[model samples]
Target: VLENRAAQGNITAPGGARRLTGDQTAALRNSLSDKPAKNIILLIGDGMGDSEITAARNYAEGAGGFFKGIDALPLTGQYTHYALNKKTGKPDYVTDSAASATAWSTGVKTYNGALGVDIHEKDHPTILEMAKAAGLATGNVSTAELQHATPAALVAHVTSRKCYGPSATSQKCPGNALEKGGKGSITEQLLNARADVTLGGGAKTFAETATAGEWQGKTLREEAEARGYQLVSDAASLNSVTEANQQKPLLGLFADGNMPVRWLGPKATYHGNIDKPAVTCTPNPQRNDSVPTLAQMTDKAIELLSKNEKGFFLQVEGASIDKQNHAANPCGQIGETVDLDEAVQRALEFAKKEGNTLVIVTADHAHASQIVAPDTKAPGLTQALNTKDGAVMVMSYGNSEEDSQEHTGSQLRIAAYGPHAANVVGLTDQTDLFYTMKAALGLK
Candidate 1:
């Protein structure tokens, strides 16, 4: 029946006017074998917790109907998110995105802000690296800067997440600087990793030289090109990279920092910040029309990486959910969560067609936001918003707006589809994901 539907062009994925082609259909059928997953696609919603999903679900269903794309999955589970504090030898209550991603990427527990490294400041190879070594194509896509915590963890090893570039003058840069006779910067490590496809925002991190004529030094983009990567900085250029060019590695950077949030309008502003960043707003007449949606990036990454006969591994992130949560804005978090949901839908659709691809959807950790029942209000509640359901509201427990907008020691949801999807069930640690992906992909 799926085969019949595939031939009929009835299988639709995200992105406007996009559907699975006959080649995709054949890949889907061929991948349905009992063999280990040929491809692994990891979708992470930064800071998305149980409560965040509930809120987003309620908002999407609008008085309750069917579950959205993620909740509709057959396998759903929970995972505890805790990182080790090197000094205390105990679990840190709240794990940041970098540590959690490193836990999943390397199966090692490290301190907060650590990326692809273990305690004692040792670098560890990530699942992405292992996949590449086995002759598989790999990619990392995010709504945030590619050098940001989650994406960087997949391809980089750094003591601190802030060291995106070689010029790390910030106090947050840990000792033994990578650029100055220390561990390498996150940007440098990512470039060295040489993923087959890398698409996201954060062009500023790579293009420090500004002009193409001034590209004499080893800037991020220059190094990427030197390594035989095709650099694409605008939407038109990205769309131009079709399957014909899939063999050549592609790199797309759409914004200076993080990609524009999905729900940007005239009134969109942060708590204390004056106005939205000039380049970080969607549906805006003022901004350039080159920003790509997370779903679009995911689709493109899959198309390129799937070209590898040995298969591929790709990571897609909705990074703005954490950014909005950290800003203590419930509306922003919900909007971003919905955007992530669309990306998840696209992954599921692709998996249904391209059978051997294992798709895992989860969050790094939880924020402190809680669900407030209907007609319930607490004192000093900075955000009291109602979902489409009349009986449910989302609220945060904070003394002030600032205090409530931090990561919490809460478990997050893990939903899976395709091969080994059932392994995500029950109580599991964040590190288990590394093993799960490794086992599913038949990696060491």
Candidate 2:
């Protein structure tokens, strides 16, 4: 419904779009500086199911944490997910991170767990590669290991997605499936390629590989530098890069693997009553390293990416949503959602006030999670949890639990806001996101 209206140029749909008044539209177009979007921020929250989305609300407006960032942004109710098999194929099950990300990056469905390859392992062009080929800057960021399924799918192609941890040249522990690709590790690719920026966890993988020569010391961070790209690792350094270095790209790696969850903090000991902490969560103190917050990374990415005159594409992920779901811990799940919500807040800041930047935010796939309904007949309780008192309301726990909640077969949640977002409001398939992204940019 929303798409049809948008296709017809009616901005008013579910969340309600408006025509830019002659003054507003004219000023917006001119002030935007006679160029395409100067920055593109693509935020993918892995394993973000409906329950997680609702829980994210609790943290901000409820007792969770301050969802102020998400709440304050322009909220549009549009985003979609679909699978090739569902339209016509053999499997009833939906897609996974690799294939789902592939749908958005390549605009096609290869297989259940494959990366940038067709169902038969034939390589396909990726959004990042295309953007690079078109002379625009590109970058990939995720809390999952740098070469984890989601991040890898956006930038590299392999016969098998799992190859990320397996090739003999892998810098990880002997059994990591993130093997070095023909050209090298994904970190090396991010470094060597023209994409100006890259940031997230999994620094250890690239660091170890660099030291061992698997990455040949072409760490993405260094690769960006050698090519005149700026390198950043902390909040301060990230803030330091800017349009002054417009011709230069940037690289930042914050953690060794799986950056800390939202509730983890530097000074506070997170004991878990979880009442919206005044500060972000910190990682295990024993890790002997400092990790940056998702909020910080979001702001940093926007700053540097905007420096480019030709426009930029930045992919950011709040990786732990899936991990929290698979753990079956409601508190942890909520913590991670809050992290994503905060990132959304940052994007909203850019969209509402900055003008021409089109911000699209949503999950790649849904997880199996249930919003355990309260058992009170007192009017509104049932609508909240969907279960009677003491009833077992299971939700997504992926394959990480010893024996806890379970995953359900359901369509994923979708939401986006801004100029190009109007086109993706309805219940569309995941494959459509790829083209939607292209359409958002007005690309062929």
Candidate 3:
């Protein structure tokens, strides 16, 4: 019923259009300038949408802050997230992370699951590749495995996002059944790309033996070490890297899977928490102490990437926001969103001080989550939506938790700061981001 009601208006349509007001048009026109940005930092909150941002703001505002760092950006715009179907050639109402990331990374509307490739399975170069080819330093960081869809799009050209590795025993990973084509696995592509800095989870893929219980690959790890990368597996080792060590490429794989979901304990209020009176629970005892926060990784990425006089292009992802959303865990989603925001804050601070960097924060797509009005009967404090006691302020996915847990075709928010920041305004296509970043960096 909620989905049908949403379909009644153009606002929920896949091709829904929006126009800028006179004031906005004027601001956009005035934002155009000739200066080129030397450094580019692209931050993606995997499942963050309009309401998700609001939830973050509400969580932050509920505590005490003028605006979350992302909300306070001077330049804001809406980007439509849509992709062409492989067979139909028309727009797919909703987009998955791979297609959306490919849209921004390569400036093409490809079928879902493609990375650095077009709809017809043709490989293409990504902005990060272009940046690297132009002698600029490149970095890819994510809370998800570095080879996950969004991060992989910038470094790997493959037919399917699930092709994280080629099995040695012919037992292919599930969901990666597409023909291998000519492209190597995402792990291989990472080694070949030799990005100046690569950090995230999924250490198992890079591990040398099947004992890691991930993949039966040994060469990926050897190849990385052979390429002169300073490999750091734990948080303490990552933090201990000195200026001399940073002169070499750095690879930090902090977790065997996606970085542990960011949270204090069960009771902490995260940025995405929407309970009228926020609820507190117990702390997660299993949380790993060796994992560094996203902000720490962001700082380290910038520190290393900045060493290049030619500048850099870095992609940072808050991956689990979407994962948590898919699982109908609002607190987990909000927690990851807040962690991403802290990283954004670090980037914003760097851009401000660096003066020539362009910082962009956006989401690949939205989830089915929204913030609903409190139930009149229970308007004081609430726990989960099903809980009977508190204000029912927070809502999860529209359909059953087991069903309709997918990405929605919604206009994602894009905020920018630093040089060329103003250029990111009004309703825009996801592909436009590629051209915008290209132009900002004066890349061909």
Candidate 4:
């Protein structure tokens, strides 16, 4: 309940008044800043639809309560995130992470499995690349692997999103493989593009030696070192890092796969909510102090990127909300949503202190989690959570009775603060975010 206690002179809410009686029209009159933003921080909650957000809020905070970061942005709206059919160029209602990222990163509508390429397989520059090209510092940080679709879209363009390393490039996307005279894999491009600050998981993929390049036959880690990438694995190493720039870009790989989630609980099962007692989430034992939190990574990235006077653009993503939803684990997804909210707070704090920075938080696409009745006995998978409000909140995953649940084609929320925040005031296309950030920084 973030109330406006700052009421107008004698125009305040009365003792029994249920509404906010002071200056809403005045507050909404102008929250926009028309000038150029010196920096932009885009925080993405992967597959964090309104349902997922509400579930997390209900579990962590009371229904009347709100999140400090997620709910802090004053200007918010919904946006469509459909992908285009690869062969027919038709509107594919639902979108995957790769296509959704491409829409906002490159301002082009691509197929579900496509990375930085459009439906026509043409490579286009992402906002990160453009920012780096324009002499503005840039960083890409995620809870998932740095080579995952959302982060990879900035550094690599491939026919398939599976082209993460040299081996995958050879087997899955030969046309885009380095040996085939194309750009190379996501890991390889991540090195070549050099965004100044790169942090995430997927250390196992780097063990694979490069198939072709100046560093062919050497492991990706060796290639990174040879290219002057300052490598950091644990939180200690990451904290020791003082600078990240074009000459000495920072690369931190904290996990072998997508980083271990923040919390653990029983997986959802058919009729489980009714069968079992409501449960609360506990800390994930695998997530030790050595591993850094998304908020920590975000804080470090902002600190490093902000060193530049020209400007900066940083992307921070909580990438496991979708993964956990696919696995039908309510606690897993809720913990991630909470973690993402923490990271969003870091960006919001930075943007507020640095008034010239524009901060925007949004989700890639809608997801499968739905808050249902306590004893609904849903068809697919369901779980009952013991919330902070001292009540049971039932979550239903009815999209699939099979192993993996699919993403839905519903509109998602987009919120912003600072320069050009007005652009997201109404229902917009996902691609419009790229233009908004591009225009905010005056990028080419």
Candidate with the greatest TM-score versus the true structure: 4
lDDT of every model, 2 decimals: 0.72, 0.57, 0.73, 0.90
Candidate 2, residue 77: how far the Cα is off, in Å = 5.6
In lDDT terms, which candidate is top? 4
Worst 10 residues of 2 by lDDT: 379-388
Give the C-alpha lDDT of model 2: 0.57
Local accuracy of candidate 2 as per-residue lDDT tens digits, 1-444: 121111223323542343222344443333233234545677778887666775555433432223444433233444444444523545535666776788788877766656676665566787777777666667666777777778777766654455443233253322222332254445544455546666776666554334344334454444345567665666677677664233675566666677766543222111211222223233345433356667677777677666566766778888877776665555456567777777777887776676667666777777755443233222111122112222223222233234433344467656565655554555676767777666556565
lDDT of 4 by residue, 1-444 (tens): 122322223323453323244555667656777899999999999999999888998888755446889887878899999999998999999999999999999999999999999988899999999999999999999989888999888888998989889999998889889999889988988888999999999998899899887899999999999999999998999999999999999999999989989999999988988998899999999788999999999999999999999999999999999999999999889999999999999998888888998989999999899999997967888889999879899999998867998899999899998888989989999999999999999999
Off by over 4 Å in 4: 1-21
Instruction: TM-score each candidate.
Output: 0.82, 0.71, 0.82, 0.96
TM-score of model 2 (CA atoms) = 0.71
Per-model clash counts, in order, read: 3, 34, 10, 0
Model 3 per-residue lDDT tens digits across residues 48-158: 998777665555433122344665466788888897798887899788999999999899998887788787777778998899888899998999988789888988877
Tell how far residue 207 is off in model 3, in angstroms: 3.1
| Candidate 1's TM-score | 0.82
Clashing pairs in 1: 28-355, 178-182, 178-183
| Model 3 TM-score (2 dp) | 0.82
